[PDB]
Amino acid sequence: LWIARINAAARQNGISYSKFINGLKKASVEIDRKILADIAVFDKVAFTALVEKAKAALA
Amino acid sequence: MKTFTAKPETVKRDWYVVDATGKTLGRLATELARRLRGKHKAEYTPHVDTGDYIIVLNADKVAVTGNKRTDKVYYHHTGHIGGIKQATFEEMIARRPERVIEIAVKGMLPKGPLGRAMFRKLKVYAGNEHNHAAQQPQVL
Amino acid sequence: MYAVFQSGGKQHRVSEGQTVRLEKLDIATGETVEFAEVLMIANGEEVKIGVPFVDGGVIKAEVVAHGRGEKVKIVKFRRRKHYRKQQGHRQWFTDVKITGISA
RNA sequence: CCCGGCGAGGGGAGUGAAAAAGAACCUGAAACCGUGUACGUACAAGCAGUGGGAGCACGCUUAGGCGUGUGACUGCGUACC
């Protein structure tokens, strides 16, 4: 349920749950994505930006 | 305050022409379950009570990719264990849209529980653009 | 205001809720202690530039108010299966919450 | 007093605190039952569940997620000695 909102559309962008998470966890302040990412269910239209932050090296 | 989402009856149905029929059949007949439940529409109740409406188009194209196709049987013996048996195989039975060679979800919701109310919501009308007997409003 | 509190409680990221914490080892029934232990609380969680976590600490502290959870709510189960017969036994604990952030 | 079989039992009177003391004389639940407020419901599985919850016969609230039970979905299982 809660992770649905960070994979159903993010799939077609290639940002695949299990395989994104190694990239993300390289940053020691970004740990608790478990429940705190669920705002993504309504936040879509300005949540689109979130993955720009480190993309140069992340992607 | 709850994280749960019952009924939901059925709030997300995603009306889709399953064109994957034959040309990558045994990849996505395995996961028509996880579609009715999930992978896009997973955002509400991905385990309990729900319904879906996927759009059928052809049936006798199973493709299936192995020696299995011309020597794997199916059995029902519907009365008194049958006695006298049956021995037709997969590309010979698929000629008929029946109950075992065409739904797939038979084997993935595999007993009847949770499946007991969602048998023909996908219509199983078969015969291409000549047989679009599905939803009049705009399917994807 | 959007707490950073997690010990026995990390659901609590809501601004008021209501949602539970711990009743801790020592006095937890006294209402208030009026002092404020935290300020790493939030930043983009409250503004027109959005983030899902703790990047900042925006001027708004959290008061020490463990509140008045004094009537004994529901706590206990038992033991039986085979001959395992314990039907009092259960030494107590409970949960409680904050007095309502006046900010 | 009134009906019925010149009956049985009740509906009011009534000695009476009382007929929940009425002569199948005990001030009084138990094995099992009848009409009903609403449930679940003539595709049934597996000690018939406590969960987790939709809204339903009904009830309180200057709106405030509760006070109520058969128990759509299904999850967990084998309560004994």
Added chain:
RNA sequence: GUGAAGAGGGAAACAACCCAGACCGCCAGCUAAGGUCCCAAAGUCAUGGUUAAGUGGGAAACGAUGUGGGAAGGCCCAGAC
């Protein structure tokens, strides 16, 4: 090795038999050993071979102009096939 007067997660559903493992709580975190497309809740990820048979969850006494990786060797352009 603690077996039941020990219950149920192990290795298949061989309660005992490898052994340390539970009082009792959560709309909270995760440890191994089974796995990890599934009923089933995470990559059709990246990075190297093999394999082209339905091979995997049936081997023992042999077989065979189908191929696969390696190091020596024989024969051959004064002409071996």
Added chain:
RNA sequence: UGUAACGGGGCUAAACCAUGCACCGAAGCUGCGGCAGCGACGCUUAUGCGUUGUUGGGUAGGGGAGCGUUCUGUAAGCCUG
């Protein structure tokens, strides 16, 4: 005596072996509550509350501690038609 050796459905590579990586994740140690036993501490000591260590399934045996329909008694004592 109904195809019934993973529980299925057999998957042509999703695999089979080697090399990278992070998710699931029994009651299994963690969040932080409460605390019976035998020990060590700060002191107290009729003794106890917390700190600190060992740790909290329980038919053979020995420790050692809670309460009743009311009888014989606390009490012409206070309680109640």
Added chain:
RNA sequence: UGCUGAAAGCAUCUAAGCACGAAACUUGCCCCGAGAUGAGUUCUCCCUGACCCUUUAAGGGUCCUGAAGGAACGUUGAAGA
């Protein structure tokens, strides 16, 4: 059973490909069938007067020169549990 014809200038029903074939599998055969609750439908025949009640898409409720009709309607019977 053999056709072309190779793997390997051979020999050749197979390798790539064909054409037939039997209690046999199938199959509008013979016999019932969504009582297979997937709940599908053709063909042919038949109903259009006034209105009320709020807690409204949930419905609840009336009254129309009483229509053509319906089963007990008088014996049964051919099937009669």
